[PDB]
Design a protein around this ligand. Structure first.
Ligand SMILES: Nc1ncnc2c1ncn2[C@@H]1O[C@H](COP(=O)(O)OP(=O)(O)NP(=O)(O)O)[C@@H](O)[C@H]1O
Ligand SMILES: Nc1ncnc2c1ncn2[C@@H]1O[C@H](COP(=O)(O)OP(=O)(O)NP(=O)(O)O)[C@@H](O)[C@H]1O
Ligand SMILES: [Cl-]
Ligand SMILES: [Cl-]
Ligand SMILES: [Cl-]
Ligand SMILES: [Cl-]
Ligand SMILES: [Cl-]
Ligand SMILES: [Cl-]
Ligand code: NA
Ligand code: NA
Lengths: 816, 816
């Protein structure tokens, strides 16, 4: 009887409030009177008041029946809060500080805070008689609101995808109008649209049927998926029919007024997408900015031609795009090809404005053409010298991709571009030699070069690649050779001397200090700690000193056990990702991280001007110029993150530091997330939290713009706008959701107010900065009318507060 | 606009499989065909086959509807398993190692292992067509089985509490027959009992109605709570009526056959409770053992008397108990009192068997009396010398409460008692003087004494208290004085010399070594570690050395992070409690614990003979004497724990060590729990786990007796009895639940087999050792027929294996 000599291990054991309710739970059929009472009760709830009948009915069916005897415990003070309760029968007594206060019966509600967030209870509800409770947990409640709003969104998106007039909207644009869909119920007999009405609404049947009439005579019936009113979004046209609902039926609907707010003029937007797609097939226009291309689209002459028409024959047309049909191109008598839908022609003439248009173009069928004239281009470029502007703008788009140049003012960036000189090299010429001290930066005009180090080759570089930019900031040996490996290579270049006549001290200091940070590979043992400069509860923030180079850093220490206990294993690596990739002047720059069996580490630049929380407190109520500066700065950082699909989620003055020059640095990305669709989790600081996070029906990047509203309000008015005196979170969220926004009598600037109201608009679609234009609407708001956004990023503005000496918050390797 | 200078902190973020299913979830009305398919599907499930129709219907309604499209993910390999699924429509394909295997449609089931326990998936189920799934999670499934069985139990207990014939059962006894209740459905017209039937079943109406007939003539109707058949449990009597159900109705029912198995003869048990309550009002019989009192109850002469009858008048009646009515006591012509129901008399005559009964007793009304004669007492005591036995047994019950004496053989304990001598002291006499070396142990016969140290007093001690027992084991100074603080105090005493002629080396060594352990207050810094002697994964087990005394210990180190990550904050303190209180020779003795910011610590005695797992492997198949010894030993440890309402829950040879003498020590109380009612959590080692833990309908201490069956099977037969080859847990639990128990042809002992079958009885009520007698049925089983339980606890048996030198498992301050 041989025995296994293996070893086999045992299974181990795993709310408290959720255990008690499980004892009282029973099944019950949901009568008419039950459904209507719950339905009435929820419409007085903080969260559920905005919900329509269909959504509340779904919630109702997820409620569970609970049965209690007299003198039985329901909820206790200081326990973790999970359930919300509607009393169905009997009486229930409320003990606060173990001393009776209230008495509740049928219709009454309690524990509404548990739905919003896991929260410590206030009272101890006790059962007097043999009474009963309808109840639901947080998890179930939040999950249910997620699925209702999420399915609503996805279904409406599919319907957007099957309406032909939206076919040429971009991904982002379709997602934005999906949110403008309003669901609209119809009973039998209700006319959905009437013949001859000048309606402006598109309808899409979700489920149901509807009869179509023309001049009171039935024509057909419409089934689930059918739609009507496309043309009503583009033009003022009477309805071609009377459509009447046969059975109970549900429509997803979009109105032109909301579309125009969210999207702008739909024709204008569609055409820009079409033109931008066409123009970007050319290597010339692919180097234009989106704004330039949109202006070409807005100003293009569009013409319909019959077949066999000579559209061009050797005005001042430089470029031609086929919108519809087909044309044939000819050089003298030789056809050179046929252009179909979306193809275009004219690169040669766009590049040489003085050149005689030699080709001819002949329609093969009835066609629609867009034409770009010379003056159309010049308006777009702001300059009659087309060839020079195009060249200038080619150089501009190369350097605006590099950290060193992309934040310089426009005037500085232009001067620098104009200072470029050109040299030609023979093959085998050493453009740069490893070990020598450089004074030049290079952009490749023509041909190819080879990057080498001590003989061994590293890579190859070609047209419009750049190299040697460090020579502009430091005097140091070149760490590689750049060898001309083609016939007659041409480079653009700029001398360090010219660069220093253009860039002014503060930006130069910022750049000098910043680019150095990657040079120095830091090891933990090379760091000594000077002092503590912060204390996050999670761990510590030590001010550290790198002995070899004497550069000073901040080291954030983050205990393993604090991460493990809260189930933040998933979240800490997502933070490291976001933190590592951030490369903006007003956002903290990570240097590297370190691993350890006891605690994680973030090594970041040291910021020496203290928190913004304390700066506004030194300044008092900020004037317009001071609020422009700080809000401006925050706007650029936030906009940078939204461009990368990152919602910050915790914007507040505490999370912004000031550097030595008085310019801001956003820190603390613990709440930040890469936004893949709609977010639902409840994260952030209550006073700064947007109502859509609280209401649990989906949010996006828009939440950070609401927070921006809160910040401007504190800056200009002083107190927070909602729940300024409140400790109790429930009451904070109540003021956020339903409180009145007011402004004190000492706020004398109508534009500041206008701006604060529109940033603090409760519905995201009404909120400035949340439409198709994004932050442009904010930046161009009259509040910023006198404010030079250009000089902000380029450190050319006198900031509100420059710290005398250093100031810290003192008295106040894969991660797995 | 002053600002709050507080700080406000942010809210943070918190299955994976549970997130996906939430997307596919929809509402659906449960039709007849749905309910019957689910109902059919569950009756083929490993867990749900034993469940009756009402229980399965409750499960059915908790199932949720899920809707999928073609090529959508349901379950993935290597993910954490939560749901069980019944396919309602369409086809579903099963990928193992990412390579297709099976095809499933309507009626088919998958993921049944997820219900039992959180487990890693085997396949990836994928949706081919637009098919649908009925599904339920583990949490919901386990919670639902908890509530059904728990409410069933509580309701049946209340009904037990309202049946008069059970009024005199103890708490424990009522709880045991509650489990014998069988629920029995009746339709309209079905006769529940028939007039003249010799039925043996008690019925209790839960909900419903039923008509009573005598001689075919209606008498009354019965309502919810009404019951009938009390007398059928006690006697063979025809039913007095025909009771027929009017409406659909549900009965809780107890049968005499099951009662007799669970409880024994109900009359006999009731009477013992009544007699034991009465007899214990006397200070004499309160010193008797439960067995002695039960024998007095079983043999008492019971008589009914008319009023005004002289029951006693100056046979050999020594004691008298009034069962019914009232009697008056008289000394000659003076009444000395009236004895009502449950009162008794005769202390004077019980203590002096030769004394002439001088009182007389006169019934005041019709009465029932129990009488205890002299020979009744003598049979109970095993001795004609009543006064001497009573005295002997008074001494016995004093010493059997002390560790030092309570495990000695009976013959040794008797000899020692017989060796007691008596001295008398004057007041102010120093019975013991602090600082002197003692040779005596003392029990106080009469009067009081005072414990003092250096003048300051500590406590007072009186009749039948004891002191100075350490003088029996060590030669050392007395740490306190014992001063006679009453007139003419009398002590019993025994000399060390006499004690050493009775107790033999092995027990003496055990006692010497054990009692020392409390003397030495250990501090962490006084410990140096010699080596590692174990590695639990949770942490380490170091062999440590106390420098001052040179005593050697085991130190178990338990990392904080291992506790925090698994949510074992609740459980580690419950373990420390249980571990600290254990004070049995065959269970590991804790010395103390220590706290630390990095890891918890258990300091325990060092055990040097290695695990039992390895010992049976050296021995091979154990003979009868060797299996008796180890199983015997385990039985005493387990019985000790059950007496303290502790279920061990992880009994297996790995959790038992052998000491230097070859006697066992149960270790590792991580799975152990103080059992407050029925337990539900799934804990332990699969191969040792009892079917009632697996089936999720409640368990108790009985689980450890099933495990004992597993152990005996490995000892005698060799392999495990269920799932001996299986790694896959699902298949282990399947063999436990429905597998056939077989025994190899080389097992030649019919009693061993009999025992193994009854320990491995699947239903707890059929399992030996789980009835009212507890372990007595096991200890008296013919398997143990030649085995001296007395010598086991007293270390008077040659054990199976004595280790040559030490052997470890080497190559193989409130806690918050
Ligand atoms: N690079 C830095 N330079 C200077 N001070 C810093 C730097 N990083 C962090 N600090 C300071 O350290 C504090 C704590 O850092 P932070 O990442 O916000 O921690 P936390 O866990 O989110 N808790 P909290 O203190 O409420 O913000 C900050 O508020 C700053 O005052
Ligand atoms: N007092 C002791 N004397 C000698 N060996 C001991 C002692 N305590 C523990 N050990 C050994 O250390 C091992 C680990 O202890 P244990 O408490 O069972 O840890 P665990 O976390 O449950 N894991 P496991 O090793 O599977 O049992 C035991 O199996 C013994 O071999
Ligand atoms: Cl897009
Ligand atoms: Cl036009
Ligand atoms: Cl150079
Ligand atoms: Cl009891
Ligand atoms: Cl009798
Ligand atoms: Cl003594
Ligand atoms: Na912060
Ligand atoms: Na163990």
């Amino acid at each position: 009887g041989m025995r296994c000599n293996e070893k086999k291990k045992a299974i181990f054991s795993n709310s408290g409030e959720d255990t008690l309710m499980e004892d009282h739970l029973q099944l019950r059929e949901k009568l008419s009177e039950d459904i209507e009472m719950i339905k009435a009760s929820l419409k007085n709830n903080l969260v559920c008041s905005t919900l329509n009948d269909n959504e509340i009915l779904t919630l109702s069916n997820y409620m569970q029946f609970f049965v209690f005897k007299g003198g039985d415990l329901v909820i206790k003070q200081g326990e973790k809060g999970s359930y919300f309760f509607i009393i169905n029968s009997g009486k229930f007594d409320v003990y606060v500080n173990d001393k009776k206060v209230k008495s509740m019966g049928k219709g009454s509600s309690f524990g509404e805070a548990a739905l919003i967030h896991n929260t410590q209870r206030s009272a101890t509800i006790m059962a007097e008689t043999d009474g009963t409770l309808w109840g639901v947990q947080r998890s179930t409640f939040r999950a249910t609101l997620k699925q209702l709003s999420n399915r609503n969104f996805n279904e409406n998106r599919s319907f957007i995808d099957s309406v032909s007039v939206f076919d040429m909207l971009t991904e982002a644009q379709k997602n934005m109008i999906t949110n403008a869909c309003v669901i609209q119920m119809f009973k039998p007999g209700e006319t959905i649209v009437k013949q001859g009405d000048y309606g402006d609404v598109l309808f899409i049947l979700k489920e149901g049927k509807a009869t179509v009439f023309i001049n009171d005579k039935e024509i057909r019936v419409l089934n689930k998926g059918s739609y009507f009113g496309e043309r009503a979004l583009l033009y003022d046209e009477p309805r071609s029919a009377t459509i009447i609902a046969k059975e109970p039926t549900a429509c997803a609907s979009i109105c032109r007024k909301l579309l125009n707010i969210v999207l702008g003029n739909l024709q204008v937007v569609l055409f820009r997408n079409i033109m931008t797609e066409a123009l970007q097939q050319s290597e010339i226009f692919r180097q234009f900015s989106a704004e330039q291309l949109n202006d070409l689209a807005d100003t293009a002459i569009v013409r319909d031609y019959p077949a066999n028409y000579h559209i061009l024959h050797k005005k001042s047309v430089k470029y031609l795009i086929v919108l519809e049909g087909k044309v044939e191109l000819f050089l003298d008598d030789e056809s050179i090809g046929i252009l179909t839908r979306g193809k275009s022609f004219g690169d040669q003439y766009v590049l040489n404005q003085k050149q005689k248009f030699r080709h001819t173009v002949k329609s093969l069928d009835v066609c629609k053409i867009a034409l770009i004239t010379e003056s159309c281009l010049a308006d777009c470029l702001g300059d009659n010298n087309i060839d020079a502007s195009i060249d200038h703008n080619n150089k501009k788009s190369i350097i605006k991709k590099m950290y060193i140049f992309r934040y310089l003012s426009e005037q500085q960036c232009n001067l620098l571009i104009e200072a470029f000189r050109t040299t030609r090299y023979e093959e085998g010429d050493y453009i740069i030699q490893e070990g020598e001290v450089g004074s030049r930066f290079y952009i490749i005009k023509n041909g190819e070069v080879e990057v080498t180090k001590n003989g061994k080759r590293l890579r190859t570089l070609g047209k419009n690649d750049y190299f040697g930019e460090r020579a502009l900031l430091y005097d140091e040996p070149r760490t590689a050779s750049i060898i001309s490996k083609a016939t007659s290579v041409e480079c653009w270049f700029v001398d360090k001397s010219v660069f220093l006549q253009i860039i002014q001290g503060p930006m130069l200091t910022h750049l000098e200090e910043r680019i150095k940070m990657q040079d120095t590979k830091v090891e933990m043992h090379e760091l000594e700690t000077e002092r503590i400069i912060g204390r996050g509860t999670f761990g510590t923030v030590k001010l550290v000193h790198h002995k070899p180079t004497q550069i000073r850093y901040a080291l954030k220490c983050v205990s393993k056990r604090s991460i493990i206990s809260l189930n933040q294993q998933n979240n800490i690596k997502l933070e490291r990702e976001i933190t590592a990739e951030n490369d903006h002047p007003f956002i903290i720059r990570l240097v590297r991280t370190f691993k350890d069996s006891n605690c994680f580490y973030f090594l970041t630049e040291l910021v020496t001007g203290g928190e913004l929380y304390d700066a506004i407190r030194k300044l008092g109520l900020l004037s317009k110029p001071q609020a422009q500066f700080y809000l401006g700065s925050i706007i650029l950082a936030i906009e940078y993150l939204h461009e990368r699909n990152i919602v910050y989620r915790d914007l507040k003055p505490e999370n912004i530091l000031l550097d030595k020059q008085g310019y801001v640095k956003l820190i603390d990305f613990g709440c930040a997330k890469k936004i893949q669709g709609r977010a639902y989790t409840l994260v952030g600081t209550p006073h700064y939290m947007a109502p859509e996070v609280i209401l649990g029906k989906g949010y996006g990047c828009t939440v950070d713009i609401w927070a921006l509203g809160v910040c401007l309000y504190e800056f200009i008015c002083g107190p927070l706008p909602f729940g300024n005196d409140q400790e109790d979170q429930l009451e904070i969220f109540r003021d956020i959701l339903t409180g009145q926004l007011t402004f004190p009598d000492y706020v004398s600037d109508q534009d500041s107010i206008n701006l604060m109201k529109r940033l603090l608009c409760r519905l995201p679609q009404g909120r400035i900065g949340c439409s198709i234009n994004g932050f442009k609407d904010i930046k161009e708001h009259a509040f910023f009318g006198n404010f030079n956004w250009d000089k902000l990023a380029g450190r050319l503005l006198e900031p509100p507060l420059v710290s005398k000496g250093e100031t810290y918050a003192e008295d106040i390797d894969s991660w797995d």
